[model samples]
Target: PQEAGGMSELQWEQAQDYLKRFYLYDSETKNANSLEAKLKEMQKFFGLPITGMLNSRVIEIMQKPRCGVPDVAEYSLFPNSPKWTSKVVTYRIVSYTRDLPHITVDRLVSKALNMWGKEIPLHFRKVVWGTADIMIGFARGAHGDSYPFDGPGNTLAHAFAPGTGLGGDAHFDEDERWTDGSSLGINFLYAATHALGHSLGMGHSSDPNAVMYPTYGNGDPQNFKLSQDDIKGIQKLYGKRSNSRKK
Candidate 1:
């Protein structure tokens, strides 16, 4: 209505600039017909109305930052972290895939890791990118380890902090389809984000807006930026500095 925020051009710019890894359209719409077509395109991609017209909600969406918000139920919303905890402390990371598509979930995983990377001094190299500490793989029932996975979604998955064993391993139940039913209720990204928050020594935050929160409710506003609590929690564990890696 009323062309939404009117700054459709600018909003498009914001999306491109924020979701650089995924979004492609810049702030340049050709004609009204083209604009309408583009609107439906974004709607389809984002699970929006697909009405083919910009609306106030769409404007608000554009205004927010970028971040993923996959939801799950079986995470350990810790009473608290180890007082002074540090996810950056270090450890090996591994993975397993099942019902969910690898790229879909993997993209979310990349974004989740990137989310943490933007917060702390730590940076995750794609193993081959460097020292090769974390290992991303697929498995079931501890994959020949002690922590036998309880098949069929009893536990979403888990990982360890930077330690000698079980440090950086991420798991997903070979059950959930990344999304419950056809609804946007839950996503593997949400679960992995929660797991990673634990791996980072970030206890579940009370704030709904926080990524470290045990349960993900509201999907990311869009910007994908971290809440103050997330930053404070991680910093408390790792200490603060002019980390060029931060967003």
Candidate 2:
């Protein structure tokens, strides 16, 4: 534990949990080298100095409001990059939070999906009945899934990669004061955009400008658009919008 630098027992425990959750560290094994390597990976991801120590800066970033999805995946192994095989993907708003009206939620959710729709060739349609390709809802701690929300801050929301069943579904932490505009609470549009990016099978980008970047922040909801890196990543999975008609 001395390798964690000056962190106390509590600080070390918190740092380990954070690293395990997002940086893919296996605490069961408890390897110092692995922990430091994962810390370095996280430092690189957030553009922090690569000291490989459990410093205050790293702890601060961990405390920031971010997505629940793990930052690093086994890209080299099987199921390398999961994506929806269909051209037209359907979705439904399974539930909504008490913070906003259902209509407002619908509009914002549609708008969030449309941000990605405008970029990729895939089309997202809203269905009123039956199970849709993507299911969106809001719930508090210990919902149905194993990954539960952590009250207000830390994790804003999470979504699954494209696949069957739980795949492509997004769950927002109802404890958060979700809002459409830039108010005192978390911006639903921004959080939804990031979660939907995951639903569409795009992982977190190291690029700070990319919408898929893990941390959540206030961007102009009215003027928000995916960054160039995000565009490239999504397009690589689903081709760009075709503008030509066959001769």
Candidate 3:
């Protein structure tokens, strides 16, 4: 311990404990992969911009009581303007499933999509349910497509947006669980929700409240409503005037 004016041993010990509870493990390898992940989480806790970096400004915030739900955007955007309403339309699931030829992970993922559809005023076009050329059924990477798959733990899979040649191309990482079962690893439905966001033109947002946000949520099982940004995104693409919805 330093002099009395300096931090006492007790104070330092308490500080250490608090840091363990709230701070990210910088030592972790994953953290190096992206500073934003941890910093983003920190921002969520601090109501700072979710850029994923801790600055002197953010450090000042750590001592205060955490405020505002991390993901909630300041503006609360949704059904934002209905910009592309006339041009945008939903599409029937062309084809879907899991890495396992006979597993129901895809079906579970459908449940998640249906869940969203039930709540939102979206419409999908009718289409035959035909399996895609690549269904993430066990492979290394870039089977034929430009995208590639890892082993079975890292990246979660992905699907291209609906557009030109590269559009509408959905893919999964051979590395992830890709299963209906929800546990420690990524859940198929949960992960699909994010992918679906991409399929619809959503990239990622600093707002943690939005599904389009990069990190996953543990409390989602209890509350899975779309964030303000997500709502605005879909409404912008499709018209706000929806027919009778499921939910």
Candidate 4:
């Protein structure tokens, strides 16, 4: 067991608990003695050096902006990743971002969902009313969920795991300037696309470029794509989509 950054005893405690809460530390019999093993696991998960100590880099990652979902599994695997029983999954935009045109948002929403639909047996249907399998919208601050959006930074959005009720719902932080393309504002498509990954039962990936990665970033919406890691994880639960071009 090694220590880095020379953090105080209490600071080390905070770091250890944070990692454990985020599913970065998965030891069932965790205790004071388990910090080193947990730190090693967290470091390896983030591709950091396998130093069994809390270092500056690990601390920085812990402080960085990330998704709102609690880490539910060791490393990045989703335990019992839920899947829809129906081939046709319906979604409704209960609300839309004023930052983008109605049609643009509509198209991008479809585009994001289609990224998965085209890769699995799933089909997406946009409904104006009634209950959809997936419910999507934008809201600022606490919008009636366990996790609330923080303005502009911190959390961009979050979604529910596959199930009934809030199962596939996706919500965006309206505080962040929503952009259709890459710009100073956060890209709506990018955040929604990632939230959709969670809505579809996929968890965060260690790969930084993955759409399922817990952080938000810009991408070329003109020709957006999911990382192969993302595709494989989604397909593992739903099986491969028919007529998919990318092998």
In lDDT terms, which candidate is top? Answer: 2
lDDT of 1 by residue, 166-192 (tens): 344455444434552244535555565
TM-score on alpha carbons, each prediction: 0.49, 0.83, 0.50, 0.74
* lDDT score for candidate 1 against the true structure: 0.48
**TM-score order of candidates, best first?**
2, 4, 3, 1
Candidate 1 Cα misplacement greater than 4 A, ranges = 1-101, 129-131, 145-154, 179-185, 216-225, 240-247
For model 2, the run of ten residues with the poorest summed lDDT: 238-247
State the lDDT of candidate 3 residue by residue for 1-247, as single tens digits: 1221135656543333333333322234233335445555556543455354443445343333221111221232223321213333343333334543433654554555555565456554323474332122333356665333534532355455444423444455555555544455565666667665555545455455766554443364653555566565565555563222211
* Top-TM-score structure, candidate number: 2
TM-score of 1: 0.49
Q: Assess each prediction's global lDDT (C-alpha) against the native.
A: 0.48, 0.70, 0.44, 0.65
In model 3, how large is the Cα lDDT of residue 131? 37
- Candidate 3 to truth, TM: 0.50
lDDT of 2 by residue, 91-204 (tens): 778787777888888788788888888887777777776888788888865876655677777777766777665576777878777886546677778777888878777777
Worst 10 residues of 3 by lDDT: 65-74
Residue 237, model 3: Cα distance from true site in angstroms: 4.0
Better of 1 and 4 by TM-score: 4
